């Protein structure tokens, strides 16, 4: 069974006294007419918990707070017995559902006791109220504040909540309210600011009474349903295969230095392979190598052996290291090598290969069945530069799909922004990339792949207005969305993400589109009267036979 939070959940947010004033204050609060849970048990503590108990003779006893409360770490406790409250943060072995018959501590239906809790800035906050009730199994419709009683400067991590013997429990939410203070300083009334458009009007005007008129209160923004990115082409990669396969392998005597520039690096090809014999990159991670841009890539096809494979690298010296290729102290590069002798050598012996010895090259005559410790393996290492020239050795660019006729966040080759895309009759020039308005803003773009001209329109936006007769007379309000098509208004004001008091006007049986915008909440009539609440474009609204009507003045 669930209960509606009738005008409940109000507590003093600040230790300040105010007489005859309204104060629009923002903090965590339990919404007006929100849903609370009844129980007859472990619960979470998302931000705060509003707790109520409706019993006859103090049957309820205590509570257990904390995160897991298994005594494996900190766990707060609150206990009560014979008009005495014992409070602690000590760690006893807490039972699964404890019942009755150290960094700090403390000591001390017929009646309704209310408890609301929270934690901010490493402190424990309690606001409480005791109310005289005598009725059964319901939440009385009444307004009363919660009074701050205790503070515990613990700063314990609390996410779990327990009760020990009505179990009305409700969570606190970050909502703004318009408090009302009387002369005595007691909170006399309050308004949840997201209950309904009338609440919005009260919040803006800072009043509990609003007279006849149209009151523009909230702005209205459509949000991108998703995001898209586009890019010029699939790829113009380098011929990394040419310096990679190396059937006609390089000579170690003069290590082949290859300059690579102006490509889209196939870093993924030998990075996402998982089928490579020798990889070990030092100075740059092997994971995000596919998203980087460098000026000049030097790939050296070098000759290595079974034992000298790791010799030519920072941290190891050796003959191949000393004579042919010597790694520096802070090389920024990777080691890549195909390690097999079935291909590295020929049948009968690869005598043509030579390793520098009088440095002058000693022949690297690997046998056809040469041992692993003597097997040659083509060794390749890539070094990247940052010269006074454009860096063109770059990773491939991921392009998403072109989704049109929706509010989306796009990224067209760095010309980016948020808008709604529509194919245009506008024709560009075969060298043109994007269009521009008189006031120098982006309006039209060319999709890099299909070479079509699209129109970019701002995501729907505008302001909300509330049309209402004086609350002194009536409590019905008609809402007007400005300069928008009626089709997208409910989801654009987040229809699903609103309380039903808002959803009743997010959509409706009476949606009227005017020149000034789309009006919800007043059925249009075909008569004409001396218009009283002016809407715009000749349209005005009033309260008549009863409901609100929209007509031409």
């Amino acid at each position, epitope marked *: 069974a669930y209960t509606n939070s009738f005008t409940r959940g109000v507590y003093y947010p600040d230790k300040v006294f105010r007489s005859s004033v309204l104060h629009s204050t923002q903090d965590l609060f339990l919404p007006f007419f929100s849903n609370v849970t009844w129980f007859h048990p472990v619960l979470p503590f998302n931000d705060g918990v509003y707790f109520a108990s409706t019993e006859k003779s103090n049957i309820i006893r205590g509570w257990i707070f904390g995160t897991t409360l298994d005594s494996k770490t900190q766990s707060l406790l609150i206990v009560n017995n014979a008009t005495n409250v014992v409070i602690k943060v000590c760690e006893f072995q807490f039972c699964n559902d404890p019942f009755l018959g150290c960094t700090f501590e403390y000591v001390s239906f017929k009646n309704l006791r209310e408890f609301v809790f929270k934690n901010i800035d490493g402190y424990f906050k309690i606001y409480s109220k005791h109310t005289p009730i005598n009725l059964v199994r319901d939440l009385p419709q009444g307004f009363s504040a919660l009074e701050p009683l205790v503070d515990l400067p613990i700063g314990i991590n609390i996410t779990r909540f327990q009760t020990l013997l009505a179990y009305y429990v409700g969570y606190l939410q970050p909502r703004t309210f318009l408090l009302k203070y009387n002369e005595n300083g007691t909170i006399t009334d309050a308004v949840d600011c997201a209950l309904d458009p009338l609440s919005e009007t009260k919040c803006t005007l800072k009043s509990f009474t609003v007279e006849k008129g149209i009151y523009q209160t909230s702005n209205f923004r459509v949000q991108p349903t998703e995001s898209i990115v586009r890019f010029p082409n699939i790829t113009n990669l380098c011929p990394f295969g040419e310096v990679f396969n190396a059937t006609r392998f390089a000579s170690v005597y003069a290590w082949n230095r290859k300059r690579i520039s102006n490509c889209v690096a196939d870093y993924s090809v030998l990075y996402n392979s998982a089928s490579f*014999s*020798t*990889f*070990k*990159c*030092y*100075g*740059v*991670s*092997p*994971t995000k190598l596919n998203d980087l841009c460098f000026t000049n890539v030097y790939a050296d096809s070098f000759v290595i052996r079974g*034992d000298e*494979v*790791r010799q030519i*690298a920072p*941290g*190891q010296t050796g003959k191949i290291a000393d004579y042919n290729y010597k790694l520096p102290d802070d090389f920024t590069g990777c*080691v890549i090598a195909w390690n097999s002798n079935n291909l590295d050598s020929k049948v009968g012996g690869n005598y043509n290969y030579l390793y520098r010895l009088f440095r002058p090259l000693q022949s690297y005559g690997f046998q056809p069945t040469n*041992g*692993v*410790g003597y097997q040659p393996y083509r060794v390749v290492v890539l070094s990247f530069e940052l010269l006074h020239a454009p860096a063109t050795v770059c990773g491939p660019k991921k392009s998403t799909n072109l989704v049109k006729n929706k509010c989306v966040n796009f990224n067209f080759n760095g010309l980016t922004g948020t808008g709604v895309l529509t194919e245009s009759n506008k024709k560009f020039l075969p060298f043109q990339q994007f269009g521009r308005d008189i006031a120098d803003t982006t309006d039209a773009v060319r999709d890099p792949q299909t070479l079509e001209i699209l129109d970019i329109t701002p995501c729907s936006f505008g302001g909300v207005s509330v049309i209402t007769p004086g609350t002194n007379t009536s409590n019905q309000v008609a809402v007007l969305y400005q300069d928008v098509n009626c089709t997208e208004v409910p989801v654009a004001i987040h229809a699903d993400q609103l309380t039903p008091t808002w959803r009743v006007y997010s959509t409706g049986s009476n949606v009227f589109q005017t020149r000034a915008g789309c009006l919800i909440g007043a059925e249009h009539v075909n008569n004409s009267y001396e218009c009283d609440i002016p809407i715009g474009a000749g349209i005005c609204a009033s309260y008549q036979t009863q409901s609100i009507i929209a007509y031409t003045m």
Partner: nanobody
Amino acid sequence: QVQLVESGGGLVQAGGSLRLSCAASGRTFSSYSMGWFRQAQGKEREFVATINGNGRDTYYTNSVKGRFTISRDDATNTVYLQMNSLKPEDTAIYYCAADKDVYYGYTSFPNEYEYWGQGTQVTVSS
């Protein structure tokens, strides 16, 4: 002197799952990116697989492609060699070793590890 200590061998037949802890003392540990090796008798020093300091990357050879997975530890400063699907010839002396910290990734030459431990020997009997 670095005492690279190993334990976690087993006499179990195909299917039993065991771990290979490589504990060292007197030296930097969390920063040391260390990978596991073995010395199969009838073969020379060989590479099996490797892990890195943040548990960032892995590289598995084609004889332990699905058999071995690697996962580290933080508090007791140790890396394990997880394993499954034992092979009859797989029994040998298993030597995890240590190498000065690498920026990322792995070096797979069995000589690339310089400080060598004592070893944990798994057993497969066929």
